[PDB]
Structure formats: C-alpha cells, structure tokens
From Swiss-Prot, chain A:
This is Galectin-9. Residues 16-144 form the Galectin domain. Disruption phenotype: Increased natural killer (NK) cell activity with enhanced degranulation, higher expression of NK cell activating receptors, increased frequency of intermediate and mature NK cells, and greater production of interferon-gamma following murine cytomegalovirus infection. Defective iTreg cell differentiation with impaired Foxp3 expression, reduced stability and suppressor function of iTreg cells and reduced frequency of iTreg cells but not natural regulatory T (nTreg) cells in lamina propria. It comes from Mus musculus (Mouse). The chain holds residues 2 to 181 of 353 of the full protein. GO terms for molecular function: carbohydrate binding; enzyme binding; galactoside binding; protein serine/threonine kinase activator activity; signaling receptor binding. GO terms for cellular component: collagen-containing extracellular matrix; cytoplasm; extracellular region; nucleus; plasma membrane. Keywords: Chemotaxis, Cytoplasm, Immunity, Lectin, Nucleus, Repeat, Secreted. Disulfide bonds: none annotated. Accentuated expression in liver and thymus of embryo, detected in embryonic heart, brain, lung, liver, and kidney. Highly expressed in adult thymus, small intestine, and liver, and to a lesser extent in lung, kidney, spleen, cardiac, and skeletal muscle. Barely detectable in brain and reticulocyte. Expressed in placenta, uterus and decidua during pregnancy. Expressed in CD4+ T-cells with higher levels in iTreg cells than other T-cell types and sustained high levels throughout iTreg cell differentiation (at protein level). Expressed in myeloid cells in lung.
Curated annotation (Swiss-Prot), chain B:
Accentuated expression in liver and thymus of embryo, detected in embryonic heart, brain, lung, liver, and kidney. Highly expressed in adult thymus, small intestine, and liver, and to a lesser extent in lung, kidney, spleen, cardiac, and skeletal muscle. Barely detectable in brain and reticulocyte. Expressed in placenta, uterus and decidua during pregnancy. Expressed in CD4+ T-cells with higher levels in iTreg cells than other T-cell types and sustained high levels throughout iTreg cell differentiation (at protein level). Expressed in myeloid cells in lung. Disruption phenotype: Increased natural killer (NK) cell activity with enhanced degranulation, higher expression of NK cell activating receptors, increased frequency of intermediate and mature NK cells, and greater production of interferon-gamma following murine cytomegalovirus infection. Defective iTreg cell differentiation with impaired Foxp3 expression, reduced stability and suppressor function of iTreg cells and reduced frequency of iTreg cells but not natural regulatory T (nTreg) cells in lamina propria. A beta-D-galactoside 1 binds at N42, H55, R59, N69, W76, G77, P78, E79, E80, R81, K82. It comes from the Eukaryota. The chain holds residues 6 to 179 of 353 of the full protein. This is Galectin-9. It comes from Mus musculus. The gene is Lgals9. Binds galactosides. Has high affinity for the Forssman pentasaccharide. Ligand for HAVCR2/TIM3. Binding to HAVCR2 induces T-helper type 1 lymphocyte (Th1) death. Also stimulates bactericidal activity in infected macrophages by causing macrophage activation and IL1B secretion which restricts intracellular bacterial growth. Ligand for P4HB; the interaction retains P4HB at the cell surface of Th2 T-helper cells, increasing disulfide reductase activity at the plasma membrane, altering the plasma membrane redox state and enhancing cell migration. Induction: By viral mimic polyinosinic:polycytidylic acid (poly I:C) and lipopolysaccharides (LPS) in microglia. Up-regulated in macrophages following infection with Mycobacterium tuberculosis.
Length: 147, 143
C-alpha cells in the first residue's frame, strides 16, 4: 500500500518540466495517467538532473510497427539504446504508466502490466527532475512511497 | 562442473548436464567469420523441442545490434534489442552467460553486455544450440 511523497501534478501543460522533491529514491513509484494523442508518433518521459544529462529516457515511438527506446544521455551523448520491440500504448487511448525505482533498475508498467526494466547507468539519486513531452496529454503525475 | 565441448562443429547442439542452475557460467570462446551476417546462441528445452527459452542473436546489420528473445509454442515473443555490437567480425571473442536467479547475465570480452530476464523457468533448459557465422574452440561450464 502506497503513500504520497509530494503533492501530485495535475493536468500539466505538455512539454512539462517539474522537480521531484528529494530526488528519486528506492521504492518511489512515479505514476503518469494520460492519453496518447490520436495521431501520435512519439512521446518522451525523462528522468534528468535539472536536458543535458538524462539518467533515463523513455521514448515510445509509433514507427516501424511500434517500439520503445530506453537510453541514457551524458554530457550531450546518447549511450547504446535498449529497444523493446512492442508498443504497449494506443493512439487516442488512455494509459497508466508507472516507474518503480528499485535498487538496480527502473521497473516500468503500462496499464497494470510489466512492460520493461532498465538498469541504472548513472545513479538514480542524482535525478531531481521529471520532464515529459511529445504527442500525449496527462491527467496527472503522482509520487508514492511504500514507507 | 561438466567437461568442455572442444572445437564443436557449427551448427551445434549439445546437452547441458543437470540443466541450468543458479551460478552456472557457460563460456564460449570463438571467432566471428570475416563476413559475418548473423549468429545464434539458443538455450532450449529438449522436452518441447523447437521452443527456445533464450535466443541470443548478434546481427551485423543496421549498425550492428543484438536480439534477445524467447520462443514458446512455436511463437516469438517481443524482442529486446541492444543497439550495440560488442563482437568485431573476423575477431576472436569470449562470450559468457551467467545464470542468475532472475536473469541471464551476458559478458562479452570480459565486459558486461546485457541481461535478459527469464520468461520461462530456467530449470527447463537442458540444451545449448549454436549456429550461424562463427567457429568455436570451446564451450566450458563452471560454478
């Protein structure tokens, strides 16, 4: 059972950028509730420091049959991409998107089902910002702890 | 752990004595063919033949990348692609699979390359299959 870590962001204007109080922490659950636009090609969820360094870049693309890119950006440089070759979102449809911060990875769920993992390439502690952009809208983003 | 296969002839299929278990390292020392398009390391279960628990498949195409996947009931699941090629063609390699509780851990030339979380129980694997553009001097097993 989860408790809120910080007041949520409600109906935030895309492109959105906002602090995560105290930074990412083990057991933090970040939930995004929103709708993929009807003719969406891409969107982006970034966990960054304060766009130059992105610890975790989550980038669904409705291209080439539909797939999702996980990656990290350091000093302006993209690392090797990890692509999960399936599209768990649907243009025009609402979705629930959850990021669980674990010790060794982000676990990602889409609509209450496991979708991908992404092992930390830089520590999650240095993240104090979530940025969201691209072809979607959001009802909310929540922050929840088990503690 | 069990005794090595030595210059196994590719395409190859051999038993893994006792099957997979936690802490097992399976090592492949080999050489990528000079004009290598693709190769395949499959972990399979001889009791449902053509299924593959873990398919590891470097592809020298589109910049070089590696496919990890699973085949069940004759059906491929969603591919996990690492968009990076850690094998140079014509060059030797040390390919290393570490069986862990919740994943395969893959080391290439002594560097961590990828993990692949188990989708079917790892205990089902009693077979290693190697095919495509390479030759192999060894497959070892230790604990």
């Amino acid at each position: 059972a989860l408790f809120s870590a910080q007041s949520p962001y409600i109906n935030p204007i895309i492109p959105f950028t906002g602090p995560i109080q105290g930074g990412l922490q083990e057991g933090l659950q970040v939930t995004l509730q929103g709708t993929t636009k009807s003719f969406a090609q891409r969107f982006v969820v970034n966990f960054q420091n304060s766009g130059n360094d992105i610890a975790f870049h989550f980038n669904p693309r409705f291209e080439e049959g539909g797939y999702v890119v996980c990656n990290t950006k350091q000093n302006g440089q993209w690392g090797p991409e990890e692509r999960k070759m399936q599209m768990p979102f649907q243009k025009g449809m609402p979705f629930e998107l959850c990021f669980l911060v674990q010790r060794s990875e982000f676990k990602v769920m889409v609509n209450k089902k496991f979708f991908v993992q992404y092992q930390h390439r830089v520590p999650y502690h240095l993240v104090d910002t979530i940025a969201v952009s691209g072809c979607l809208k959001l009802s909310f983003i929540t922050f929840q702890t088990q503690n």
